[PDB]
Structures are given as C-alpha cells and as structure tokens.
C-alpha cells in the first residue's frame, strides 16, 4: 500500500483493490470454500450446496472466487514468464510445479518444490532420505489426512 501496489489507482491503471487478512478461530471445516465464505460472513461455518457456485453468488451473494495460497503464488510466475514456459516445466498432463514432501519418521521431513510426475519413492529416497534407523516402511498417505 505504501508503494502504491494496493489501494486506489494501482500503478496508474485505475483498478482499485483492497486486501484484508481475516484470522480464523480454529475450525477445520472452514477450509471448505463455501464454508469459508460462511465463516467470512461471520456465521457458523456450515458449507453450502452447489449449484449455485460461489462464482455466481458467493460472499454476501456477490461473485466470489476462492483459491489456495499455492495457486495464487503460481499465478505471478505464469504472468511474468509466459504460458509456454509454464507448460514446458514438466512433460506431464499436470502443468507446473508443486510443493511436495514427506513427513513422519523419515530422515529429512520437509517441503520441496518439484515438477508433477515425480514419483513418491523418488521424494522419499532422495529428498526425505528414506525411513530412519530400525524402521520398516509400511504405508503412506499421499495428500494429508483426508
């Protein structure tokens, strides 16, 4: 806002945009996008039936699009380096990179940015470093608790 990148007349275009940070009150169901809309309006975070989608009538009945942090962080690279660059990151049907990583009883639990199509054994045996000493690998969840 101090640099003129937010607020009124952003970079002389005339586009007015204001950005707020809404800190939640600790409930998992608020991550659901329609329930996120309900909790943003100060209601009990009950999700909403679709149709209608949030794109037609979302926050306070207005058109509203909900996106993840990582998607909105992927956007500026696309707008700065082009479209064919983003399509030519990986030779897969899922374009672009992704924040992946293994956690739980591994040598190096963490987060790394990898292209799509990277196998999970590659992540486990190269970035995570495999299981720790005296531990036999039994199962794995690819994408969290759900």
């Amino acid at each position: 806002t101090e640099a003129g990148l937010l607020g009124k007349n952003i970079m002389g275009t005339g586009f007015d945009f204001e950005l707020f940070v809404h800190t939640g009150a600790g409930r998992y169901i608020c991550g659901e996008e329609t329930a996120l809309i309900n909790s943003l309006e100060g209601r009990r975070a009950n999700p909403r039936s679709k149709p209608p989608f949030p794109a037609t009538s979302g926050a306070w009945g207005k058109p509203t699009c909900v996106n993840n942090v990582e998607t909105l962080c992927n956007v500026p690279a696309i707008l700065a380096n082009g479209v064919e660059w983003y399509q030519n990151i990986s030779k897969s049907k899922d374009a672009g990179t992704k924040l992946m990583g293994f956690s739980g009883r591994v040598k190096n639990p963490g987060l790394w940015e990898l292209p799509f199509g990277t196998t999970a054994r590659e992540i486990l045996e190269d970035y995570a470093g495999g299981m720790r000493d005296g531990l036999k690998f039994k199962a794995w969840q690819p994408g969290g608790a759900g």
Partner: protein, 156 residues
C-alpha cells in the same frame, strides 16, 4: 454485569469497517473480547450482539461453534498440544502424559491455581517438526517428554 471497554468497542468498530456487513466482524469481536479477558463471558455475547446489530443467538452460535473461542473460564496460559496424525506418529502421547503428570489435570480442565489449562488442538501446520504444542502465542516443536518441565517453567 458486563460492559465493553472503549478499546474493545473501537477495535470492533474498526473491524466492522473492513466488511460490507457488520455481521462479518463477529468472529473478530469475540477474539477481541477473548484477548482482553482470556475468555468470552455471558454478558459479552449480548454486548457484541448490541454493537454489531445481530441477534445474541447468532453470536452465541458462532462463539460455541469455533473451538478457539472460550465460553468457559480458563487459566492464565492455554497449553494446546497437537493430537493429530503426524504428531501421533511422532509420539504426542509422551507429551500428553508428561503434561498430565506435571499439571495433575485432565485435558479440558484447569489447575487449582489457574496457571495452565490443558487442551488438545487440531493440526498446527507444523507436521514436519512434530510433535508440536502451541502455548498462548508461541508454537514449540521437536518436543520430547523430558523437555516439558523446562518449557512450562518459563510461562509463569
């Protein structure tokens, strides 16, 4: 009786400036009252309802819906240990047993002197550094059951 202070009312009104509906500041108003008083008492529901212009049933439903809005009195420090799946694999049971042995209370209860209140919480988003535990403002990771008394002593 209950009465909102000037600072609480000013903060609630400034939060009401950020939304096109005053109802949308209910969560933040409850959090403001909770920051100033430790928890949300019974008259605070009607006070926040009067400030925002929404029914007290709506404010009470929001207050009892969300886990981190306390409608019962707590201690001076809220111990919140993660009991989710990655911290289960990393062994939060030792942490919970150490906290129960040190504080001599069950989860959800408060000590006799009102120093700590023990609560399990959801995943703290620090699964690669588990087991984690969030005391009032600070998240502590890579926890061991022998480091619990040295960590609780700094919270007087």
């Amino acid at each position: 009786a209950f009465e909102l202070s000037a600072a609480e009312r000013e903060a609630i009104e400034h939060e009401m400036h950020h939304y096109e509906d005053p109802r949308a500041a209910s969560i933040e108003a409850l959090k403001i009252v909770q920051k100033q008083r430790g928890w949300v008492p019974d008259g605070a529901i009607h006070a926040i309802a009067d400030v925002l212009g929404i029914p007290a049933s709506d404010v009470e439903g929001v207050a009892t819906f969300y886990s981190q809005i306390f409608r019962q009195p707590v201690g001076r420090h809220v111990i919140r240990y993660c009991d989710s799946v990655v911290c289960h694999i990393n062994g939060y049971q030792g942490i919970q047993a150490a906290l129960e042995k040190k504080l001599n209370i069950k989860p959800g209860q408060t000590t006799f002197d009102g120093r700590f209140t023990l609560l399990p919480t959801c995943c703290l988003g620090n699964c690669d550094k588990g087991p984690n535990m969030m005391i009032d403002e600070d998240t502590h990771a890579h926890l061991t059951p022998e480091a619990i008394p040295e960590l609780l002593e700094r919270y007087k």
